[PDB]
Amino acid sequence: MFNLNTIYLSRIFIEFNFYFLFFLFLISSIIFYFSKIISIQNLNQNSVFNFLKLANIFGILISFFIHIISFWFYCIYSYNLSLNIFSDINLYNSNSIELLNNSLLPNYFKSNITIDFFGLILLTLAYIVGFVSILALDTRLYWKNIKYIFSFTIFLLIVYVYVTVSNILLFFMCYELLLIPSFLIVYFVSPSRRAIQASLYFVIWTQLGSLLVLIAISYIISITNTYEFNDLKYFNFTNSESTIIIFLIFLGFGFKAPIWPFHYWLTKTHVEAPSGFSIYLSGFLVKTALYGFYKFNTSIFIDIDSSIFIAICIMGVVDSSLKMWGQTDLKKLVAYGTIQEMNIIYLAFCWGDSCAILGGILFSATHAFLSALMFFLVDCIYRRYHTRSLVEVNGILHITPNLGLSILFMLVFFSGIPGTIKFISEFYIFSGLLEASPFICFILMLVANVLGLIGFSKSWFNATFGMPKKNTKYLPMDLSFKESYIILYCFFFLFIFSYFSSIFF
Amino acid sequence: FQKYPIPRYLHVGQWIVNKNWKWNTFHMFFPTAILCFMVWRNSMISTAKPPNYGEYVDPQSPVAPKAIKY
Amino acid sequence: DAYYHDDTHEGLMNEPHGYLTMDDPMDLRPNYEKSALELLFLVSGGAILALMLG
């Protein structure tokens, strides 16, 4: 009972949601630029900055609701589209449904929209993580730097183009557009003085990875003069060319993943970036790198053994997990947890397009939400106690009971409790790896789920418990409704996403 | 342990006594019982028990375990 | 026990107290972060109910 209306419903919703976000951004930018001469905040109640914040937060939220509706439309459309090809067994008739373009708005960048489940999962992560990050950046945007309230809308538009185009060049460009806003956020919004060098490190590392990916895509474009994945399907690369391409894409997207030994930039940036960007950096952009690697490697036939890449990913996991005990800084500890989770997810994409990308996508979403929650907790601790080191703050549970409870439940969720989606992703990846390599699977599970977990819990349990004896005059208050609701939404997603349709997982 | 003063602003549970705890107990027990009754009905829809005393499973009945016909 | 002081006569047997959150009950700001997050929660719940529950 799947008719033509739902197809156009999904396509129209995707295109017009992109245009909704773009029109909101354009109107907000026009108002911001043409209402003031200097375009800095006027320090009074009657300021455009209030309207800018309202417009951006509401654009993000309403476009997220529209994206939920369009994601459900896409799920139904994709299920029934795969069904229609599978359904008919008669050899005389084939599924030939040719669609028309909409009349009101043009195809942006003259490209037909192609939607995949991984792309829309990435877009949903973009929406939610950007919402949380912008909610975590209101205290940082002030006089002369309010212009970065539009940064997350720019990210949403870039990724919306990124996950909906079948053009390989537009794909690469949208992957490449995520650097300038990120560097601008780290350079101008970060309060720490050490964040300038962190921004430089982030730029240079991610741009070396981008150069490697650029070499790979240049090979792809120059050899087979096209920009379509189907045209790639109609072409074969020799063994040497395929080896060079896979090495280049893996190394670049692992510079962005990050992977061992290319996570120094991530550690420095996470320690020094503002908490909102740290939520957005760990939660989302690395997932864009994963999506790029998945799109690049799946479309190319590779005949080499992936044991080297698997070893690199597992070494990254082990290296990140063994360093969690020696971290007295909660934000750096969360950064190492992000490194571990990212390397685990990147491991799942080392078997091509087998039934291993499902665990990769689920773990990408789970790590997005977990990293957002953990960096948000670090933000709350740093805003309350004005410190992040374990030697300066402890006994949070007794002065700020809600923050301590949130920390404890974050640890429970991070320990892979079966009710949540981290356990599902671990089950997928570890079952596949155990059937692939049992001893390496046991090594990965031992180092990650015991040693790394022990260190991670040690650095958080010591902060949660104790006595906040010093500075009783300066002790903060409990959690506000915004932080409480953000934490509860992270918990709610990590719990209820286990009940998502298993067709795509 | 000797009682010590607790800050008024702190939402902690140290030596907390609610004078109206009886109605709170009523209105936290009975709706919980109703919710658990509904969940119990839902789970009793999907419930399996072995045959009672004196009852055997006919191997040719549809209830008996089945094997795949390739 | 030997010398027990009942709840009424106890000077340190607290009744329920404390502020639930850090939000000022008498806050005069048109702050909308709480409303936005409540809207996000409710719309997500409705989308699950109205699109995915059955």
């Binding site: 005990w325 020696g326 006595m467 004896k469 010093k470 | 010590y4 003063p5 | -």
Partner: peptide
Amino acid sequence: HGWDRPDVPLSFNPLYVHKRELSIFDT
């Protein structure tokens, strides 16, 4: 009983004063 005891002293939770460098090798 038999004496009006003051409230529990703040000495019940003595403030620890760091007299030594917290070495990073003892992290």
